[PDB]
Amino acid sequence: RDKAPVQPQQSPAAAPGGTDEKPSGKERRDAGDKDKEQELSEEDKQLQDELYRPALEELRRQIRSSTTSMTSVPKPLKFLRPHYNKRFAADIISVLAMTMSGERECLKYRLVGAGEVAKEWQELDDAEKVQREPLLTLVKEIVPLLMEIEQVDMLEKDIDENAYAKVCLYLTSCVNYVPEPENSALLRCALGVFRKFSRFPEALRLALMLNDMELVEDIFTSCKDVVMLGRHGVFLELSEDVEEYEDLTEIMSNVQLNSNFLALARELDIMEPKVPDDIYKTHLENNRFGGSGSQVDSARMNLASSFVNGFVNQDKLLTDDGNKWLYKNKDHGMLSAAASLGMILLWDVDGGLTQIDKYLYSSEDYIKSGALLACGIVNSGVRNECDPALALLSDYVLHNSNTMRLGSIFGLGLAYNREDVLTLLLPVMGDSKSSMEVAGVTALACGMIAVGSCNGDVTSTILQTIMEKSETELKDTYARWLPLGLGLNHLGKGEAIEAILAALEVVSEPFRSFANTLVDVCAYAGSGNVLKVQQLLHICSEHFDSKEKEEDKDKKEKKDKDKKEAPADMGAHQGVAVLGIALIAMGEEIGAEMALRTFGHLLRYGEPTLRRAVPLALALISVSHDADPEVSYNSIFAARLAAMLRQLAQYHAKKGTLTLCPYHSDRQLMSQVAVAGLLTVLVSFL
Amino acid sequence: ETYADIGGLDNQIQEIKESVELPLTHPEYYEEMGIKPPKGVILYGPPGTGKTLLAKAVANQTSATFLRVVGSELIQKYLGDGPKLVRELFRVAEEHAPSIVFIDEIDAIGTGEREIQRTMLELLNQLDGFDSRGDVKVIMATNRIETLDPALIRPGRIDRKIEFPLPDEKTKKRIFQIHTSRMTLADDVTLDDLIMAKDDLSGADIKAICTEAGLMALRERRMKVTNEDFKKSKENVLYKKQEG
């Protein structure tokens, strides 16, 4: 209708004209007006004017919110004391109260840091619980505990919509953009609403991110009350970290209520059903053992054959193909081949003793040391082979129990804050043998033992290895693999002060500064810390040619979830190892067409470091299109490292720390063949 | 638009499926025989237009490198360089061995002119495998099986040939069923007069009136297909190919 009779009604200041003109504006407010509310130029004089003043404030905030206003909108509502499923209610409530309380919660949440914003925010909470528009008013009310009482106040009937949708996209966006102190509220409030509701495995993911000991007991009495079993045992034992499986094995060593929580909590029930399931449903051909086991020569392709053999566990023909195969190999090949019988037998705990006992206490030191390493690899919960190896330990110069210390401390570290082995590891780190792998498997052993701690620790373990690290600035490989275990102990995020303490005491000559940037690598598991991205771009142009490799190599760990941003322009640079930084930054994912697109360019290189580094990620990222890149390797090559590693890819073709540590420690393969004894015992390969 | 979407010729599409999906795929029943006739099948169709033939060649698009040399259009629109373009496509097909060379709308002899015979004889010489082996398959498709000269038959077809039956409103029924499998429309739309509206048409201009039926039906801000707007948009296609 025309505004001729009703337009001059707002000009006089008569009280009856207001008390009847304003209800007319409430009646015609369902569609607003005939136009975009161009009456502000005529009704703007009523700002200084004030019986039914809440209706005048409602009209004022209605028109000021109608045309334009950024701060003056919610003031008439916070002073109005609002009083007195329809189209009108959806109009003035849904979008006008959504944006209204959105900018009120934004301006008040970002300005000061009262009850008005709580009453308005809960009023919008209930009004939008009636309107039932999901994830929109939620995604607007994310940044303004309030979210705790909001979720427990809303999560009554809708379970899979808010849980699946809100927890899915708000979990991905929460770990992507939302900072950590609010993600902890997502974990505790999600522990509440998910503890009171069904779908336990997502609360088990909340136990993976929380690393709490009560959640596994509540999910064991709640999963025990509501009874498949072997599956949640599989991803239960695989999902749990180093802390809650020993705390779990001690509280279940206490009561356990069924003997099935330690029956499952021990490394017997996640592995006893796999043997018949793997042997029955799968049937592997023998042409890989015959061919790939036939074109091996030069004592290095035979090492690749000990790799293919060791990482086979159906068929056990190449495992027992005669003798002298271990005798013809080299010393480090006697270590890897001696551990091969342990890598092929991560099953059948009863027969492991009568199968590995043949090489025990033999005439050769590497056979018995790799045999104790085999005993450490075959199992992880037996812990009955410690005494005959860890007992004596008295060498002090060179004796066999140092290599048996490699296999037994490394294998026991894979089997495992237990002091029953660290008190014996104190003279190990205090010995400082010239052999690098001693402090290698010792620092990595205590590191993998110390992952998952409560905000880490700055005790005399890392303090002792730092004082003894800086004691002698020789054989910088120690200054390279010691920061591995240091950064492993730096786990325990939640704004711990270990990075600041290391930034205060560790800052020295660029070796311990390389240790410091390694602490910066392991200290950024992931959060909203874009300062690490602008700092990454700022420090990316450093003259030091190793902190670019490790610090820039951290890209595959920091943004490992949002893989849409992982491909970058690192290939267009001119650094000597930046193509290796992106090549390793590819990783072990499903291997989309973009990844193989990067391997098409990274595959053709002249240096043996990139040509040797490309088949590992090329075959790990793809587990009639798998062997074709290997044929491309045959077209490129047809040295020894490229052939042994290309066969390693020939068999490799077909946030847990256990899957993040081995390759990050493997980033120092460009050294002597002594590391090749540790190259084949990587535990991250499933 | 996959190999299992269309009906009425499932045997004719599982013949080309089981025929050209034999090399480089499913090797347990491929290397024991040791035949390898690297010639590929040859398709044709009286309707043609690339819709049915593309619906037959779409079986290779499941898991393979995308590469289709559709017709000799680029041979005649360019200078008389001759077979060197086919040599470049054959060497990039050599560097792209896990592929299937598909040719649609062969208009070499159906449409300077003296060079078509020499580039077709040299095309036959390079297609037969003068200096090659069973690396990539070659599928030839056109609008008429009689357009291929007898020269291109004995050294151009040694693998298998097929026969395409007349549409008999069953290929049109299945194509229209696919075009109506995603859109929302009741049975109020007469099928026979629209699949046989001008003289006969399988999928091309019915896909066109489905595109301008979604767009033209979207002009009215309603997802429903009005009984007068669909034929009102059909009058443009019916009038276009008949006025000139």
UniProtKB/Swiss-Prot annotation, chain A:
Note the segments forming the PC repeats: 336-369, 370-406, 407-438, 441-475, 484-513, 642-654
What SUPFAM superfamilies is this protein classified in? ARM repeat
| Basic and acidic residues biased stretches | 19-47, 547-567
GO process terms (BP): proteasome-mediated ubiquitin-dependent protein catabolic process; regulation of protein catabolic process
Q: Does the keyword Protein biosynthesis apply?
A: no
Modified residue Phosphoserine is at which positions? Answer: 11, 24, 292, 294
Q: Could you tell me which residues carry Phosphothreonine?
A: 19
Q: Does the keyword Signal apply?
A: no
Source superkingdom: Eukaryota
- Low complexity bias: where? 5-16
- Show the Pfam families listed in the entry: PC_rep, RPN1_C, RPN1_RPN2_N
What's in the keyword line of the UniProt record? Acetylation, Phosphoprotein, Proteasome, Repeat
Task: Please name the GO terms that the record assigns under molecular function.
Answer: enzyme regulator activity
Q: Where is this region: Disordered?
A: 1-47, 547-569
Q: Which residues carry this modification: N6-acetyllysine?
A: 475
Q: Which family does it belong to?
A: Belongs to the proteasome subunit S2 family.
Q: What does this protein's UniProt record list under function?
A: Component of the 26S proteasome, a multiprotein complex involved in the ATP-dependent degradation of ubiquitinated proteins. This complex plays a key role in the maintenance of protein homeostasis by removing misfolded or damaged proteins, which could impair cellular functions, and by removing proteins whose functions are no longer required. Therefore, the proteasome participates in numerous cellular processes, including cell cycle progression, apoptosis, or DNA damage repair.
Q: What is this protein called?
A: 26S proteasome non-ATPase regulatory subunit 2
The taxonomic lineage of its organism, from the top, reads: Eukaryota, Metazoa, Chordata, Craniata, Vertebrata
From Swiss-Prot, chain B:
The chain residues annotated with the modification N6-acetyllysine are 77
Q: Which GO terms describe its molecular function?
A: ATP binding; ATP hydrolysis activity; proteasome-activating activity; RNA binding
Broad class of where this protein is predominantly found: cytoplasm
Membrane topology classification: Lipid-anchor
Q: Which domain of life is it from?
A: Eukaryota
Report the function annotation for this chain.
Component of the 26S proteasome, a multiprotein complex involved in the ATP-dependent degradation of ubiquitinated proteins. This complex plays a key role in the maintenance of protein homeostasis by removing misfolded or damaged proteins, which could impair cellular functions, and by removing proteins whose functions are no longer required. Therefore, the proteasome participates in numerous cellular processes, including cell cycle progression, apoptosis, or DNA damage repair.
| Disease listed for this protein | Birk-Aharoni syndrome: An autosomal recessive disorder characterized by failure to thrive, severe developmental delay, intellectual disability, spastic tetraplegia with central hypotonia, chorea, hearing loss, micropenis and undescended testes, as well as mild elevation of liver enzymes.
Record's protein name: 26S proteasome regulatory subunit 4
Whichever gene encodes this chain, its name is: PSMC1
Whole-protein coverage range? 182 to 433 of 440
